[PDB]
Amino acid sequence: YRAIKGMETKREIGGYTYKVVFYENVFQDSILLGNFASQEGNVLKYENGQSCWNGPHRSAIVTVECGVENEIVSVLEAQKCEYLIKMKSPAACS
C-alpha cells in the first residue's frame, strides 16, 4: 500500500487546512479527524479522531477516485464531527 501510504493532499476549505494522508491519518488544522481503520472499494474509513464538543469523537470517510492529480474535491460535515471527504488521485487509477 506502500506506493501510496503516506501520500499527502492538502486543501484550505472554510479557513481550515484539511490534510489527508493515505493509510495514515486525516487532519483539520491541528485537529485529528481520524486514523486509517479500513477500506472497502474506493472508500477509506478514518476513525477515533479528537473529541468534539457536544458531538462524537471525529471520523472521516474518504472516497478516492481516479484522476490525474491529487485533489480534495469536497469536505462535507452534514452531521457534527462526521466528515465526508471526496478526492481524486492517481492512486485510485488502474
Ligand X SMILES: OC[C@H]1O[C@H](O)[C@@H](O)[C@@H](O)[C@@H]1O
Q: Does 10 bind ligand X (CB under 6 A)?
A: no
Of the candidate spans 17-25, 38-46, 64-72, 73-81, the one that interacts with ligand X by CB under 6 A turns out to be 73-81
**DSSP output for 29-81:** TTEEEEEEEEEETTEEEEEE----TTSPPPEEEEEEEE-SS-EEEEEEEEETT
Q: CB nearer to ligand X: give 7 or 84.
A: 84
Nearest to 13 by CA among 84, 67, 68, 79: 84
Q: CB nearer to ligand X: give 79 or 93.
A: 79
Of these, 2, 30, 53, 78, which contacts ligand X (CB under 6 A)? 53
Q: Does 61 bind ligand X (CB under 6 A)?
A: no
Q: CB nearer to ligand X: give 22 or 83.
A: 83
Distance CA 61, CA 3 (A): 21
**Which of helix, strand or coil describes residue 92?**
helix
Q: Does 28 bind ligand X (CB under 6 A)?
A: yes
